[PDB]
Design a protein around this nucleic acid. Structure first.
Lengths: 158, 610, 103
DNA sequence: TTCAACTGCTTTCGCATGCTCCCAACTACTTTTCCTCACACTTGTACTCCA
DNA sequence: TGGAGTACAAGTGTGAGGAAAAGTAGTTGGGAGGTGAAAGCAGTTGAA
């Protein structure tokens, strides 16, 4: 946070989380028979079936920052490249990338050919990536409220 | 409700920038993280006082020694009057002595009258349960645990004409099952070592344990911390150790091991918040605010924050704050090793919505370290809080109102001895310096009247000649003793060795005494480049060494003048090691002892390489 | 250089509980520092530093000095001790500078 | 007889190829030789209560 | 008065507890490897 809460002559704090998930991220199996001293799983390592706490931190803090420059395509492509095919929390944020697109693009500033059937992908990507969030293990989402959010996006689609 | 859950666990460590976005397009805070945002919270004490009175371990079977919370007796179960704050604590020799009003702070009462019931066993725990807001009152009873028994008392109908607090009792129900019991809770519900039972409390103080009980006995747990609490009022007890939490319903037949903390943590403390649903759990490495569940009150594990300090003796106190739109929950962890505190400010909103702010700390009193910290219910963004501590190696009970707005006994009990013949003879040296300080102020004052005289100048003329005879004798005392291969005094004179008083003028003598010698066997070490370890800086002259020492003792002495002269002169009588021989002396012995070892020792005796 | 000739040669532990004086005891025994060199200390260069550390008036310089003159047999010569015999550090505080600190 | 047969050999180009580690990356416990002094008994010299 | 036990102290004797860079230990998790036709047409045997 000392780079995140400085913001004066900063290195933005998110380049350091990129430093973390580029050198410590390993997909080894948790072997569990060796007696672990001085490295402990739940808050500093990133094995299979355990996404790292710093890896999913670099996901959320680079989507909140991605809103606050108003680049969403730069991370929506970037989340697409790992198949974290075990955890459900990365599938919600991979739905939440397109949910920020379908909120920002659905303005149109008119007062009409490609912008209507581009958002129709971004609604469909939020709907399928939220279902695979429900398909994986335990991570509950307010999917009753999101469809109240998504239908309010549809009210400007029509 | 936000988005972050797992169904078994729910995390928010320090400045993770947590996982709870929703993208609300309402153009005012378009994110609903598990974090708040506001300004700072610095904490200042409001200090007051309430009352007073093997080595590398601690026995975990002690829980408390004091409790203090608002009470509502039978007369307050009848009349309009509601609320008197009391204190239940221990004192005496071994803590076996068992024994008020709020003016602006908490204070002991005016009538200075405690209720001294005599107990024949050391006290391990003192608590009053407190009642729920579904029963409408504040409980008048009190349960304590001794080392040899288990005694339950009760406060009944105190007075106002003399503030008399009187006790009824339950009897000491001794260990019919002969095992030490650990932590009690009422909300005779007891937790023995490994096993437990549910008891029955009598209203009859004029003359017990049911046939429903159980155990959590872990064969692979070698400590004896145990802990029970009523959880969500539906006859569900939570039995703990330093390994796991078991949820046990003692009304049905349904047991569950819920938490299992053997891998990289333990369980340090579990304070039951007076709220019916929200209750904290303190583990090591993390502070857990695991509440109960909305549909079915079994257990719902809520947002938690990690805790970096690691120790084996950590506890917690937790005090609520009622505000209109939300409820705060401050979390004071403490230990038995240090005096520090650690606090965190959670928040409870209406839809079981939790957030966080951050962490801070304060300082305490340097006599020992705390062992138990107790908060005040206080009968009901400019935050306030109040609590009271009790430190180890002490028995005083202070008072603090924190808000948004060293003498060791062995250095003292070693001196001041109490004999009769040896009562003033230690002061014979005190009479000795008064015989010498009155002397050695008149002997110097001979020389203080001597200022740039001829009467003092002829001493140094004899001084340059009285050292010069015995030193050329000493130079040739080292040539006759040179065939040795096997030392500095500057007290060769015997006149006074004190009879000249000037800092610049003796430097004219000694540097001319340095210009006296040019031959071999005589060498003098530096003084203007070697004295400087005292000022820790540049000393360009021996004269201006005294200059800031003249600027040093102006206010602290009578006349401040001649003593600073003579100590600088005494360094010239002490630092001046000036009888080193010349280069024939090291060189004759840097090769002779180099020959006592063979060629193996030659090259392994090597310098001048880097 | 092997794995214990590198760890002894580095600063692994600091000198503790008077460990620094006790190597001077092996240094005054494996070669006798008596009868070869001179074990006299400049104790006035010692007490000059200790006054301005605590900033009492300098009256206590001589008041400490009359204490040392009264207790020490052969008033001068706060000498350093020697130990050539065995590992048995004597429980007397035989070292010169430490005696000044108790004085 | 009548018939297959399957073996043999030849142009055309040609396409044209088919017991399981050995060693890295993690990590951990153990290996190898060193280092500085506590415990306890005993011994001395004293002054107490000894007839 | 002439002769014994209280304990100030003091040196004798014996191992034990501490340190670390190295090594071997215990698992994995990668990697390139290495251990016939399209058609002839004939002779010969084919078989109940």
């Amino acid at each position: 946070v000392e780079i995140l809460d400085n913001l004066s002559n900063s290195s933005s704090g998110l380049d350091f989380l990129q430093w973390m998930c580029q050198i410590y991220s390993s997909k080894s199996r948790f072997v569990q028979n060796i007696n672990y001293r001085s490295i402990v799983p739940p808050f500093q390592t990133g094995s299979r079936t355990h996404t790292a706490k710093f890896a999913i931190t670099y996901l959320w803090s680079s989507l909140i920052n991605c809103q606050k420059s108003m680049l969403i395509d730069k991370i929506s492509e970037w989340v697409l490249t790992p198949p974290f095919m075990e955890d459900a929390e990365v599938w919600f944020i991979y739905a939440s990338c397109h949910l920020l697109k379908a909120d920002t693009l659905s303005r149109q500033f008119v007062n009409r050919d490609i912008k209507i059937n581009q958002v129709i992908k971004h609604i469909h990507y939020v709907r399928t990536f939220l279902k695979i969030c429900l398909d994986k293990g335990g991570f509950a989402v307010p999917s009753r409220l999101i469809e109240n959010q998504l239908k309010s996006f549809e009210s400007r689609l029509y | 409700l936000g988005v972050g859950v797992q169904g078994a666990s729910l995390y928010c460590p320090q400045e993770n920038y947590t996982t709870k976005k929703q993208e609300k397009p309402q153009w005012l805070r378009p994110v609903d993280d598990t974090l708040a945002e506001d300004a700072l919270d610095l904490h200042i004490v409001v200090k007051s006082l309430l009352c007073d009175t093997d080595a590398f371990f601690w026995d975990p079977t002690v829980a408390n020694r004091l409790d203090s919370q608002y009470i509502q007796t039978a007369s307050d179960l009848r009349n309009y009057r509601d609320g008197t704050e009391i204190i239940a604590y221990a004192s005496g020799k071994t803590g076996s002595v068992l024994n008020l009003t709020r003016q602006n702070t908490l204070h002991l009462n005016r009538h200075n009258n405690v209720t001294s019931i005599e107990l024949h066993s050391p006290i391990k725990s003192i608590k009053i349960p407190g009642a729920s807001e579904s029963i409408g009152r504040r409980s008048n009873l009190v349960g304590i645990i001794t080392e040899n028994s288990f005694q339950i008392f009760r406060i009944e109908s105190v007075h106002s004409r003399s503030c008399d607090v009187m006790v009824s009792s339950s009897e000491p129900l001794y260990f019919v099952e002969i095992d030490d019991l650990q932590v009690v809770d009422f909300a005779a519900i007891i937790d023995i070592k490994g096993n437990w039972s549910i008891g029955r409390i009598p209203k009859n103080f004029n003359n017990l344990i049911d046939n429903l009980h159980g155990t959590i006995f872990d064969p692979e747990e070698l400590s004896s911390w145990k802990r029970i609490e009523w959880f969500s009022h539906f006859q569900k007890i939570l039995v703990f150790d330093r390994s796991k939490m078991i949820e046990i319903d003692f009304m049905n037949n349904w047991q569950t091991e819920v938490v299992q903390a053997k891998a990289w943590s333990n369980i340090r403390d579990y304070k039951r918040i007076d709220d019916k649903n929200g209750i904290l759990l303190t583990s090591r490495e993390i502070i857990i605010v695991g509440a109960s569940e909305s549909n079915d009150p079994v257990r719902r594990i809520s947002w938690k924050h990690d805790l970096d300090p690691d120790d084996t003796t950590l506890r917690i106190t937790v005090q609520k704050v009622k505000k209109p739109d939300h409820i705060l929950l401050v979390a004071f962890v403490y230990s038995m090793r240090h005096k520090r505190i650690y606090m965190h400010v959670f928040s409870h909103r209406k839809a079981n919505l939790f957030q966080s702010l951050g962490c801070s700390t304060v300082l305490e009193i340097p006599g020992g370290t705390p062992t138990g910290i107790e908060t005040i219910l206080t009968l009901d963004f400019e935050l306030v809080v109040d609590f009271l501590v009790k430190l180890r190696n002490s028995s005083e009970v202070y008072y603090y109102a924190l808000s948004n707005t060293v003498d060791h006994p062995e250095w003292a009990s070693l001196f001041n001895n109490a004999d009769e013949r040896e009562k003033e003879s230690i002061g014979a040296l005190v009479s000795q310096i008064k015989l010498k300080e009155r002397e050695r102020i008149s002997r110097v004052q001979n020389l203080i009247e001597h200022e740039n005289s001829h009467d003092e100048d002829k001493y140094l003329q004899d001084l340059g000649y009285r050292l010069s005879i015995a030193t050329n004798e000493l130079l040739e005392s080292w040539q006759k003793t040179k065939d040795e291969s096997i030392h500095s005094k500057l007290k060769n004179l015997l006149e006074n060795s004190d009879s000249f008083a000037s800092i610049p003028e003796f430097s004219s003598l000694l540097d001319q005494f340095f210009q006296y010698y040019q031959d071999q066997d005589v060498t003098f070490i530096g003084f203007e480049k070697l004295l400087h370890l005292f000022l820790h800086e540049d000393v360009p002259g021996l004269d201006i060494f005294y200059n800031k020492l003249l600027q040093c003792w102006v206010l602290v002495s009578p006349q401040a003048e001649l003593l600073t002269k003579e100590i600088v002169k005494d360094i010239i009588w002490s630092l001046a090691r000036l009888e080193k021989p010349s280069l024939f002396e090291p060189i004759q012995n840097e090769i002779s002892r180099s020959l006592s070892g063979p060629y193996q020792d030659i090259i392994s005796s090597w310098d001048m390489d880097d | 250089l092997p794995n214990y000739y590198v760890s002894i040669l580095e600063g692994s532990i600091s000198p503790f509980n008077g460990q620094l004086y006790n190597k001077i005891a092996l240094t005054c025994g494996m070669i006798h520092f008596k009868e070869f060199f001179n074990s006299e200390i400049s104790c006035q260069g010692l007490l000059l530093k200790l006054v301005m550390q605590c900033a009492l008036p300098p009256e206590f310089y001589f008041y400490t000095k009359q204490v040392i003159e009264f207790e020490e047999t052969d008033i001068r010569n706060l000498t350093l001790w020697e130990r050539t015999d065995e590992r048995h550090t004597g429980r007397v505080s035989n070292h010169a500078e430490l005696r000044v600190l108790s004085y």
